[PDB]
Design an enzyme around this catalytic site. Structure first.
Site, short mmCIF file in Angstrom:
data_model
loop_
_atom_site.label_atom_id
_atom_site.label_comp_id
_atom_site.label_asym_id
_atom_site.label_seq_id
_atom_site.Cartn_x
_atom_site.Cartn_y
_atom_site.Cartn_z
CB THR A 185 -2.79 5.84 -1.44
OG1 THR A 185 -2.46 4.39 -1.00
CG2 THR A 185 -4.06 6.13 -0.52
CB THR A 186 0.18 3.39 -5.32
OG1 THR A 186 0.27 2.46 -3.94
CG2 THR A 186 1.44 3.14 -5.86
CG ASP A 208 -1.86 1.20 1.27
OD1 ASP A 208 -2.65 1.43 0.40
OD2 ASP A 208 -1.68 2.00 2.18
CG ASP A 267 -7.21 -0.12 0.98
OD1 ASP A 267 -7.51 0.71 1.59
OD2 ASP A 267 -5.76 -0.49 1.04
#
Lengths: 40, 520, 99, 548, 538, 103, 155
Positions: B89-90, B56, B386
């Site tokens: 988020t990446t 993550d 997630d």
């Protein structure tokens, strides 16, 4: 100073500078110390 | 004198811009291997000793201490994506890190002022949102078979893709249970309970509606299995209450001291009689329970649980329908939990677990996850959060956008046609966003072992044919469209990723100086 | 790859000063004005003289712009340009080194 | 969990050894390490370039904008930067011109390579892209050449060669610095036209003497060599003219001494009485044969004893001390003399001719004047350089050497082969390589098109250092090259270039009137060295350092 | 590019971190591989305080020894979670994780990407679960035969101590369950048996008791040590008040009230004692051989000891929290808090109650019950580690016999299950693949890695593991064409094969199922981790 | 060839942990270590046995020939000696006679 | 038993020494793993004196960089002597020694004695010499073919 060392002449902090009325007062009193020795 | 005691020396000009761009690129370079279904894993060592192994983006950034001040702003960008959405988020850091990487040969080379570039970044941000809106298509939000394929989008990268068939059934019923009609479903992660139980098998799992407590029974005679349970929540402890006034009693007669202990026993019996008025089968309190109040409730068959977490009581009131009342005098039949059933305490060597099953639309559910180890079990917990976050944006808006390299390249093609028509000073910074959207699809090929040179060359030629659905495969790296394989992601994930990268790029390009030593 | 440290290569050897930014050329201006501050009162027939004592305790009293700069050892790169023009003016004409 | 494994089995090498590979962004850090010293030489490029101050460990200060000279005193750490440092030093030695171009061009090839590596281009395909584009670049330079120097020496033609080279190094006044260098070149040329002899030139012939004081306008050109010397016996203006006969002796003037155990042997008092007068007759007999030949000046290469200097003052013969070697070697080339070790009478055919020898005060000390006159021409002339500061005297000496090295480029090739200046050489190659990149199918066109983009640094640097906006000025220059070539011949649009300050908006019409041009022989090796410098950095996948 | 973020941050990327996961798991396995099997080595744990602990289980070894290497921490936490639910398999999981990495690391150097390696692990593991259902044999636990439970319980004890103490402890751990069973409810709890630590006789002289044993002795001399008929009265209330909730004091006007205020506190004590004395004589008065015993969880007033001494009543104080639930199961009584409600129905019954004095402490023994629902095990030892070594052997033997009642299916041991998976995972044909040549690479690495268990057993015995497994494959080839189902085991005595069903060796279902699944996830995440980073603020 | 590889297992466990295993030592080596304290009890055995003076860190002196009493006040780093020390402690607690014979 | 012979000494034996030869040769081969081949990587050596050595030869890497591990010292002296007489084979021997130790290390962990493993190396190597006679192709120098010398030199 802006954050960088300011050195015009080598041995900055070693040498001292006298100017103005204080420079003249030190020269007169230096002769008065020699005079009072010779006046005796 | 020293004048300023904080960073009397200053680094300004292009030297401060290079330090901001280089440090921002190093943040995205470490997570380049964290993108794609073949992405690797990263292990982190905290000063406490706890090991965190995950791919993550946010979990890696917040646990790393960065001494570079401007690079710390890159660490908080994933928090914006995680708190608002929780998925993608990446891709935010990879996109934001590529913008500054592409925007570097301007102030140094073209000598373009940052605000001039900022005005181009804001205009490119508006046009990017329109392209994402055009490529987005609505789908049925009430279709259970359609939402299972949407949750698999974030699962394909995670290690839980092997259990994805089982994991989709766990995340689907969890979001549907806590949601209710009112801003639409207004679902919140705080209502969903994820309990981590070491040991077991991942293939065997079930969604349990209720609250799973690890506390044992206060008395052996307490029945661990009730056919028709009745839950009554009490915030007041069953122990003898002492006044905060520090009352001091002066004992004179010999019968005064013996009466004090009797009155203490009479009130405890009196408080039990107020509870027995409604005759509850179960009793749950968040504080300690005295040994005297235990015997008086044995005749009525009241099972008492003590030291329950404060937030768990609010989750019990949702499933059981009970109303929290502190004083025992206001207890009524309406405040007693109803419709609850299947109360059983399973015997496990580690801890005692209590089960609850439901038959005012707000409900709650407790997902029991059984892993192979405590650290892997921590990964499934993060992967489950997630997975449920993807179904949130689907229920909020019907809009659904493509993913896997199709959305990022669809914007870059539209930016190339308008760039040649500008013919001005803003033409150069306007082309930086077009090349910045290419990092995400290029990273998918580098992690898949394919050749990004020939694939991306023919990829741009496909988008010129009028189809926006052409993606990049994560396994074979084929140019086949994403409609066949079925990759789709909510538009909110695509919007929050582009908006955050543009707002963050304008912040670091405006920093012309870096000073320290303030110590506020 | 030979170690977990993996040091970052610095372009210049440790101990080198910095430059560019804002005020680097200004630092050279204030160095020449400060040297000018001593030679200004020595101009004119009513001007004064400067007493300079070196590390060898050699007393020398000079108002000449060339001799004053020979006594002091100037380590500032830009301030040494005033020393060259003072010795060049004293070599040929001999007068005006202060001006 | 508390402490890392710290790279196990790392004891195979010493703790001071470090491994850096193209992976993990180190090849990007190597390119970023170039930009640290690249921007240092960008502000120093062109006639408006800014000189830099570098203080070494000994305290010596050298103020110059030359990239080859600045990198000498600097201590370099990163290994691939030394590839760029040693590349600029070779250009200064070989052609003596185009040093700042190699520094800038090799640095821009790595900057455009950062985008090439990010797209996935392998190091092998990137090298092949620059090699194929450089071969096409060298072929287009010979097609775009205009004009020629033709005759070796001319008053006007030497202003189109040395003057544009010295314009970047200490610009100042134009015609003042150009006349001083152009005068000394005409003296060392053998001329001898129509004879068919092979021309010859020496870059070390012209010597620059640094003398503090005075002004640049007071400088002149001396046909002879100038040294700081004090005559021993007497000073002579030599107004009796009829020129002179001069002899040069590389050996000192003194009684020949045995190389082993020189000792005075006196058996009796009879030999002692004649020992004092014996040594006086030896020098008298040797110096008499020299005075009978009409030799008024003798050049010595070592210390001369006092007994030998006595008889030299009797006949009025000057004494010169020439220490070391190279100082004495260039003295005979002026007068055309052949040294001989013996102290006997020199050969009349080996005697030189110097009309006047004068001693005057220039910078406060006595200097000897070897200057020649119209007839009996001499070689290896010197240029007196007057300046207020010694720092300016150092780079102007190297600025004159840049003009002297430009004269060497008129000998080996067939001609001068002037190229359009003001950056017009690198700009025309952009449109030619762009068309060359399309003519080559395959994936190699990515490195070829970006190879011409690296040539855009020349117009941007000249425009940025001139105080002009590179965004307004640079695209306006392509308007002349975007119209290609018309239906009629005689196209003068190839003379467009970048202007410094003034009215901006391109300008200076056609550079043919400006007379500033470039050398073709310089641009050939400037591109080859700069390409191999960036190719070497890109060809190294892994870098290993020691002790740090 | 990490040092640009922080100067003190370090990392190892790609093969730099890959060599760590392979080496650290191999180094940890090399220490714990010698503990696998009945012939395995015995480790002596000595801390800075001088404590000595002898155990062959990896749960205690990894707990006392802190692991500096972050890679082996995942194996330690995985082996710890394996011991929590299944009570067994600590050493087994450690040997599997390190072997799965070494077998897969050989293909990585050949150019195989770790992603497809993890695919071959999940596909082959799901096929092993399907074979686990066909390989296991269901048993009938309704007969409650001793011979079946003795052989299963002995197999776990052979991996702890020698055969001399094993034959003594084998009926003890077999008797550890006995009367505790439920047909319909299926609830089985092993926390009802009590583990007593005392030094008496010899470690091999210990015996099993059919009733509860307590460590508290008689507080007063006149209390009878031996009682033929005792009624256990559970009292959770403290007879001696520790403090009063509301702060109060006694203010007396004259000295005559000093003894009266002191007697005021005597009424509350006698009020609780009044109903207790009436309960003893309620059944029958002047009845010899019938005593009365009280077991209190809280403290008992030493002043009140003389009240029960005249009536010959035994009292016990400071009982454990888990002791209250065990009193209802053993003595058959009911837990009571106060004395306000008493009756002969809520009182327990015991046929024999006696106390023995060992050293400076006295222990209470209760036995001879009609239908006791709980029992205890007395663990005696000749030294300090004898109590810890035997306890770790019993606790690991409790979970073994429990899975027999929880799951009627029993899987043969002696490495017979690991060898059978070797031939099954060689060729999967077209059943489950998913890719051409990508999946078969990870399956071959997982198939050959399951053979480390039978080979490790032979290495601890001092024989050649290649020669032992050579005769195993020759027997399985002729057994398929002979229409006879045979289970080939590994015998460590003569260095030959055997039959786990005939030799009496079996393994638990939950131990082997959680070991394959648990070791697969640990080895997969280490192959998927290409970078080891450490960052933080000191 | 100047420095040893330090072994890969050096990073495993900690530097304070020491290992004595088969072929790594012990094996009648550590048996020769207890012979120093074994000879101590041999001189104290019998009616002619020799008493031994032991000074604890507190300063109290206990002079006796009893092996169970002597080994109690002595601080011994060697762990396997405690196996023999604790063996003599049981002899004194239970039977109280024959402590010298057990050691 | 070495601590009794010397007050301070360092020694590693059996499994401790088995990891010495296998792991040290693995790190040395990994340095020259990317060297082998015409497409191999290019390495530059910069010492503390300022000298620069840029070559793909594995012999320069061994002589310029010191090696603390005694296992690679035996390999470095073997790889250096191979280039002395034959002018080639520096990186070849390193890849042979480092890999053969790892290929034979898997069976050492299986319980196979090292001697019978090394005994099979000589039996397999003698067959490579007998096969070398039929593998080699004869070339006659009487033809004086220039093209044959061109292709061999380009290797």
């Amino acid at each position: 100073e802006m954050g960088r060392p300011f050195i015009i002449v080598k041995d900055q902090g070693n040498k001292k500078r006298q100017h103005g009325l204080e420079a003249k007062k030190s020269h007169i009193l230096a002769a008065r110390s020699v005079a009072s020795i010779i006046k005796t | 004198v020293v004048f300023m005691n904080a960073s009397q020396e200053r680094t300004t000009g292009r030297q401060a811009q290079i330090s901001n761009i280089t440090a921002a690129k190093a943040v995205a370079d470490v997570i380049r291997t964290c993108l794609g279904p073949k992405a690797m894993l990263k292990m982190l060592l905290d000063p406490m000793g706890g090991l965190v192994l995950t791919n993550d983006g946010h979990a890696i950034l917040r646990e790393i201490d960065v001494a570079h001040p401007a690079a710390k702003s890159m660490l908080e960008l994933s928090r914006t994506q995680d708190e608002e959405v929780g998925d993608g988020t990446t891709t935010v850091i990879i996109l934001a890190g590529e913008i500054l990487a592409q925007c570097a040969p301007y102030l140094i080379e073209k000598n373009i002022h940052p605000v001039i570039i900022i005005q181009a970044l804001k205009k490119a941000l508006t046009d990017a949102l329109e392209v994402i809106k055009q490529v987005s298509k609505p789908v049925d939000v009430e279709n259970d078979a359609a939402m299972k394929k949407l949750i698999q989008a974030s699962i394909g990268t995670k290690y839980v893709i092997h259990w994805s068939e089982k994991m989709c059934e766990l995340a689907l019923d969890a979001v549907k249970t806590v949601r209710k009609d009112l801003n639409f479903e207004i679902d919140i992660k705080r209502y969903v309970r994820v309990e981590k139980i070491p040991g077991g098998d991942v293939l065997d799992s079930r969604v349990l509606k209720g609250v799973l407590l690890n506390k044992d029974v206060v008395h052996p005679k307490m029945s661990r299995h009730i056919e028709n349970p009745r839950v009554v929540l009490l915030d007041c402890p069953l122990e003898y209450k002492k006044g905060e006034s520090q009352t001091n009693i002066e004992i004179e007669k010999e019968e005064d001291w013996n009466r004090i202990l009797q009155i203490e026993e009479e009130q405890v019996q009196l408080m039990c009689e107020q509870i027995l008025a409604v005759r509850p089968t179960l009793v749950i309190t968040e504080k300690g329970v005295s040994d005297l109040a235990q015997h008086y409730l044995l005749k009525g068959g009241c099972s008492v649980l003590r030291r329950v977490k404060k937030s768990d009581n609010n989750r019990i009131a949702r499933v059981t329908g009970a109303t929290i009342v502190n004083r025992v005098e206001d207890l009524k039949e309406s405040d007693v939990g109803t419709n609850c059933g299947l109360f059983k305490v399973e015997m496990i060597g580690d801890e005692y677990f209590s089960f609850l099953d439901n038959c005012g639309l707000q409900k709650a559910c407790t997902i029991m996850l059984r892993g192979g180890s405590k650290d892997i079990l921590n990964e499934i917990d993060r992967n489950l959060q997630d997975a449920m976050a993807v179904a949130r944006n689907v229920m909020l808006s019907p809009s659904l956008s493509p993913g896997g390299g199709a959305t990022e390249m669809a914007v870059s093609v539209k930016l190339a046609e308008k760039a040649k028509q500008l013919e001005g000073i803003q033409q150069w910074p306007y082309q930086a966003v077009a090349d910045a959207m290419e990092c995400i699809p290029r990273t998918l090929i580098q992690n898949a072992g394919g050749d990004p040179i020939r694939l991306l060359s023919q990829l741009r030629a496909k988008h010129a044919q009028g189809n926006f659905t052409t993606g990049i495969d994560g396994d074979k790296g084929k140019i086949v469209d994403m409609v066949s394989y079925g990759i789709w992601e909510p538009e909110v994930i695509k919007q929050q990723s582009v908006k955050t990268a543009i707002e963050s790029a304008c912040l670091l390009l405006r920093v012309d100086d870096i000073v320290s030593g303030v110590r506020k | 790859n030979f170690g977990s440290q993996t040091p970052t290569i610095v372009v210049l050897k440790e101990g080198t000063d910095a430059s560019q930014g804002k005020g680097q050329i200004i630092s050279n201006i204030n160095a020449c004005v400060a040297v000018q501050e001593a030679l200004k009162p020595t101009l004119g027939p009513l001007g004064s003289d400067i007493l300079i004592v070196t590390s060898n305790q050699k007393t020398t009293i000079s108002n000449d712009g060339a001799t004053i700069l020979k006594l002091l050892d100037v380590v500032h790169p830009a301030a040494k340009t005033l020393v060259d023009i003072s010795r060049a003016q004293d070599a040929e004409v001999g007068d005006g080194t202060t001006s | 969990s508390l402490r890392l494994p710290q790279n196990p089995n790392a004891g195979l090498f010493k703790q001071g050894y470090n491994s850096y590979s193209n992976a993990d962004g180190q090849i990007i850090k190597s390119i970023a390490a170039i930009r640290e010293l690249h921007q240092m030489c960008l502000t120093s490029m062109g006639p408006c370039g800014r000189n830099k101050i570098i203080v070494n460990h000994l305290g010596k200060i050298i103020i110059t904008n030359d990239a080859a000279t600045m990198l000498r005193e600097l201590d370099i750490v990163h290994p691939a930067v030394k590839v760029l440092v040693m590349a600029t030093e070779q250009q200064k030695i070989d052609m003596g011109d185009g040093t700042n171009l190699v520094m800038i061009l090799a640095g821009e090839l790595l900057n455009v390579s950062e985008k090439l590596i990010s797209m996935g281009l392998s190091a092998v395909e990137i090298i092949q892209g620059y090699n194929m584009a450089r071969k096409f670049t060298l072929k287009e330079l010979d097609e775009m050449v205009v004009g020629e120097i033709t005759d070796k020496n001319d008053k006007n033609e030497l202003l189109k060669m040395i003057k544009p080279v010295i314009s970047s190094k200490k610009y100042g006044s134009e015609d003042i610095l150009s006349e001083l260098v152009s005068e000394a070149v005409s003296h060392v040329l053998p001329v001898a036209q129509q004879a068919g002899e092979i021309p010859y030139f020496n870059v070390d012939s012209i010597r620059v003497v640094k003398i503090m004081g005075g002004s640049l306008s007071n400088s002149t050109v001396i046909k002879g060599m100038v040294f700081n010397r004090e005559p021993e016996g007497h000073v002579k203006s030599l107004s009796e003219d009829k020129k002179h006969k001069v002899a040069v002796f590389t050996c000192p003037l003194d009684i020949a001494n045995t190389e082993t155990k020189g000792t005075v042997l006196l058996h009796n008092a009879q030999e002692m009485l004649d020992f004092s007068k014996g040594e006086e007759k030896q020098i008298d007999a040797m110096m008499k044969e020299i005075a009978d030949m009409g030799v008024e000046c003798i050049v010595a290469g070592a210390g001369v004893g006092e007994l030998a200097l006595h008889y030299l003052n009797r006949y009025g013969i000057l004494v010169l001390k020439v220490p070391s070697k190279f100082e004495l070697r260039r003295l005979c080339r002026v007068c055309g003399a052949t040294p001989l070790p013996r102290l006997g009478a020199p050969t009349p055919e080996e005697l030189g001719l110097v009309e006047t020898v004068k001693t005057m005060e220039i910078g406060g000390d006595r200097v000897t004047v070897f200057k020649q006159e119209q007839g009996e021409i001499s070689r290896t002339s010197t240029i007196i350089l007057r300046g207020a500061t010694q720092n300016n005297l150092d780079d102007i000496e190297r600025a004159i050497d840049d003009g002297v090295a430009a004269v060497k480029g008129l000998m080996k090739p067939s001609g001068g082969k002037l190229l359009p200046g003001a950056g017009a050489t690198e700009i025309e190659l952009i449109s030619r390589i762009t068309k060359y990149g399309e003519r080559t199918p395959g994936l190699l066109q990515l490195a070829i098109k970006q190879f011409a983009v690296a040539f855009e640094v020349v117009p941007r640097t000249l425009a940025e250092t001139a105080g002009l906006d590179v965004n307004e000025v640079l695209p306006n220059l392509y308007a002349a090259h975007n119209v290609t070539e018309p239906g009629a011949v005689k196209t003068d649009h190839l003379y467009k270039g970048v202007d410094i300050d003034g009215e901006s908006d391109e300008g200076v019409k056609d550079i043919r009137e400006e007379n500033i041009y470039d050398m073709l022989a310089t641009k050939k090796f400037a591109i080859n060295v700069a390409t191999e410098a960036a190719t070497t950095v890109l060809s190294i996948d892994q870098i290993i350092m020691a002790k740090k | 590019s990490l040092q640009l973020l922080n100067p003190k941050a370090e990392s190892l990327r790609r093969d730099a971190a890959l060599k760590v996961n392979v080496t650290s798991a191999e180094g940890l396995q090399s220490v714990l591989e010698t503990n696998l099997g009945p012939k395995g080595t015995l480790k002596m744990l000595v801390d800075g305080a001088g404590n000595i602990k002898l155990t062959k289980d990896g749960k205690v070894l990894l707990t006392e020894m802190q692991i500096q290497s972050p890679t082996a921490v995942l194996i330690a936490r995985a082996a710890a979670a394996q011991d929590e639910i299944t009570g067994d398999g600590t050493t087994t999981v450690v040997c599997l994780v390190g072997e799965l990495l070494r077998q897969a690391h050989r293909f990585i150097q050949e150019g195989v990407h770790p992603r497809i390696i993890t695919d071959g692990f999940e596909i082959a593991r799901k096929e092993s679960m399907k074979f686990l259902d066909e390989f296991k044999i269901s048993k009938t636990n309704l007969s409650n035969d001793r011979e079946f439970l003795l052989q299963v319980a002995r197999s776990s004890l052979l991996t702890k101590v020698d055969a001399d103490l094993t034959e003594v402890l084998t009926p003890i751990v077999t008797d550890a369950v006995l009367s505790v069973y439920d047909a319909q409810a299926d609830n089985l709890d092993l926390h009802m048996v009590e583990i007593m630590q005392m030094q008496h006789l010899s470690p091999k002289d210990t015996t099993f008791i059919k009733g509860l044993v307590l460590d508290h002795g008689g507080r007063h001399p006149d209390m009878p040590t031996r009682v033929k008929n005792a009624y256990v009265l559970i009292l959770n209330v403290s007879l001696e008040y520790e403090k009063t909730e509301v702060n109060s004091g006694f203010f007396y006007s004259s000295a005559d009230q000093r003894d009266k205020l002191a007697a005021s506190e005597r009424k509350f004590v006698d009020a609780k004692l009044k109903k207790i004395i009436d309960l003893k004589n309620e059944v029958c008065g002047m009845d010899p051989d019938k005593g009365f015993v009280i077991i209190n969880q809280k403290g008992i007033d030493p002043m009140s000891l003389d009240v029960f001494a005249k009536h010959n009543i035994l009292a016990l104080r400071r009982a454990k929290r888990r002791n209250m639930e065990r009193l209802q199961l053993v003595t058959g009584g009911e837990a009571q808090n106060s004395v306000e409600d008493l009756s002969p129905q809520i009182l327990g019954f015991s046929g024999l109650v006696y106390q023995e004095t060992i050293g400076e402490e006295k222990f209470t023994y209760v036995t001879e019950n009609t239908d006791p629902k709980s029992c205890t095990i007395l663990i005696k030892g000749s030294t300090h580690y004898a109590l810890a070594q035997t306890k770790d052997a019993v606790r690991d033997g409790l979970r073994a016999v429990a899975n027999v009642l929880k799951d009627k299916n029993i899987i043969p041991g002696a490495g017979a299950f690991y060898i059978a998976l070797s031939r099954y995972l060689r060729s999967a044909n077209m059943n489950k693949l998913g890719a051409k040549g990508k999946t078969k690479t990870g399956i071959e690495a997982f198939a050959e890695a399951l053979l480390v268990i039978p080979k490790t057993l032979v290495k601890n015995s001092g024989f050649d593991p290649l020669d032992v497994l050579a005769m195993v494959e020759d027997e399985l080839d002729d057994a398929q064409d002979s229409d006879e189902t045979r289970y080939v085991g590994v015998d460590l005595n003569i260095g030959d094969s055997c039959d786990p069903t005939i030799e009496g060796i079996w393994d638990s279902y939950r131990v082997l199922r959680n070991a394959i699944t648990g070791a697969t996830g640990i080895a997969s995440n280490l192959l998927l981790c290409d970078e080891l980073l450490r960052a933080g603020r000191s």
